[PDB]
Amino acid sequence: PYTVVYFPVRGRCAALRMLLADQGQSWKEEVVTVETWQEGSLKASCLYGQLPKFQDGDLTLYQSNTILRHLGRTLGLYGKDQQEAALVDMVNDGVEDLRCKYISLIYTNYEAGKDDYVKALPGQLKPFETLLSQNQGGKTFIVGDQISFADYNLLDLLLIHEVLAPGCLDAFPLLSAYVGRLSARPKLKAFLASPEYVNLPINGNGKQ
Amino acid sequence: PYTVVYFPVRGRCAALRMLLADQGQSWKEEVVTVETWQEGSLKASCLYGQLPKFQDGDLTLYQSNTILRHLGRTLGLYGKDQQEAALVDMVNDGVEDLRCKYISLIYTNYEAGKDDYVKALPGQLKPFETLLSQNQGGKTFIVGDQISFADYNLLDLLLIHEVLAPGCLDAFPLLSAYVGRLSARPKLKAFLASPEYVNLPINGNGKQ
Ligand SMILES: N[C@@H](CCC(=O)N[C@@H](CSCc1ccccc1)C(=O)N[C@@H](C(=O)O)c1ccccc1)C(=O)O
Ligand SMILES: N[C@@H](CCC(=O)N[C@@H](CSCc1ccccc1)C(=O)N[C@@H](C(=O)O)c1ccccc1)C(=O)O
User: Fold this and answer.
1) Which terminus of chain B is less hemmed in, N or C, by CB atoms within 10 Å?
2) Ligand 1: does its nearest atom lie under 6 Å from the Cβ of A9?
3) In sequence order, what are the residues at sequence separation of 6 or more whose Cβ sits closer than 8 angstroms to the Cβ of residue B199?
4) How many Cα atoms are found within 13 Å in the side-chain-facing hemisphere of B4?
5) CATH code where residue A144 lies
6) Ligand 2 centroid vs B58 CA: distance in angstroms?
7) Which residues get modified to N6-acetyllysine (chains A, B)?
């Protein structure tokens, strides 16, 4: 089945975990501690020297987004056609860009840069509000009328920003409704409330 | 047909241009100067406020990698099956990670960081030499026995590094042969030698 090898944090596995949970999939968690990692052996066997590492049968994958795309492709969460597939990618790449900025803030200069980052946030979030407004008035998903892997990734991005800058979504009616709507899905709601998710820190440095 | 809107540099369009050229595709180049861009109107109409912008019929796309994936999907340069598709993504995500570091160096601290970056290069390139060694002894492409969009992107990444750190590929026999082999493809060779490619600066700040 599936196996995700990662540190004891949500980080770059939050979205893929929400996807698996919501799709009713079972998976094994192989927790790697900071101690085990610093030993060196595992890091050396990793293609790019980093985690997450994922396994689907004997297929071993690296790169969080490759994992997301793989699951989206095999589980049917990649749009109804090529046009939608292209739009899903465009949304995900957008999410990834903002995620890198978020990660840079958290690990590089949280104390110093937190204020400027929050001020610039509205400009960073507008593109997604726009995408939503152009798709059935933001009544369904980010792309098309069926959920995609980009939805889970965008949802995660939005949730961690709610924690960073509480109320940052107030100015965006469609994103707010979108978050509430997706968070209400049966399997996802159960997962988001579980100790498995809740008791894990968002980032590896205790900042959020 | 196709239309790529971008600044008069190779930058993030080099790989997609090589792909189109090598696949025998025709496209229109809509050049945007720094002056036109600073006027504000175009930037405001761009989803994430950035270029490249791409058009395939009435489908408008943003994000260089989304464009690459779209072309790979429609032109059949995305592996023979899902397993290969996942591997192609893993390679591309790896290329993208190193590209960001390259971009950070070029635009953030070329003078100061050039030495440390070149010292760390071997560790950054090893993963691709490894991927090559596990695929038919590096005799064909990065993934499988047919060219993919990841190949064009990796090729571009390798070429710009040859310019940055001449001879950096000497220590990697498979990557070197790979570069020579791909650069020898008929349509690609013609394109790489043309004024269209050659007379365009690699980056927007004249550094390389
Ligand atoms: N492009 C890759 C990026 C993977 C990545 O950044 N991996 C990090 C872990 S994610 C952030 C994190 C950091 C520390 C703790 C928990 C989480 C990674 O592998 N980082 C280690 C590394 O680069 O060796 C590392 C460095 C320092 C301490 C602990 C681990 C992807 O999308 O999959
Ligand atoms: N994730 C996106 C990133 C796009 C991007 O970085 N776009 C840049 C242009 S690429 C680098 C470049 C910079 C300057 C000149 C030529 C090239 C982009 O749109 N940058 C402009 C911007 O962000 O407004 C910009 C800033 C300053 C001067 C000129 C243009 C992708 O992969 O498509």
Assistant:
1) N
2) yes
3) none
4) 25
5) 1.20.1050.10
6) 23
7) 126
Please give the order of strands across the beta sheet that includes A2-6: A27-31, A2-6, A53-56, A59-62
Are B163 and B180 in a shared domain? yes
Residues B133 and B167 in one domain: yes
* Tokens found for residue A22: 């919501």
The amino acid at residue A77 is L
What separation in angstroms does the CA of B149 have from each of B42, B67, B95, B111?
28, 10, 11, 32
The CATH number that applies at residue A62 is 3.40.30.10
Show residues of chain A in contact with B16, CB under 8 Å: none
A109 in the same domain as A93: yes
Nearest Cβ partner for A94 among B63, B130, B131: B63
Nominal resolution (angstroms): 2.2
B89/A70 Cβ within 8 A: yes
Whether residues A48 and A68 fall in one domain: yes
Residues of the domain holding B29: 1-77+186-207
CB B204 within 8 A of CB B11: yes
Residue A53 corresponds to which tokens in the numbers above? 């590492």
A67 and A165 part of one domain:
no
Instruction: Using a CB–CB cutoff of 8 Å, tell me whether A158 touches chain B.
Output: no
CA–CA separation, A159 and A163 (whole Å): 7
Of B30, B31, B28, B22, nearest to B2 by C-alpha is: B28
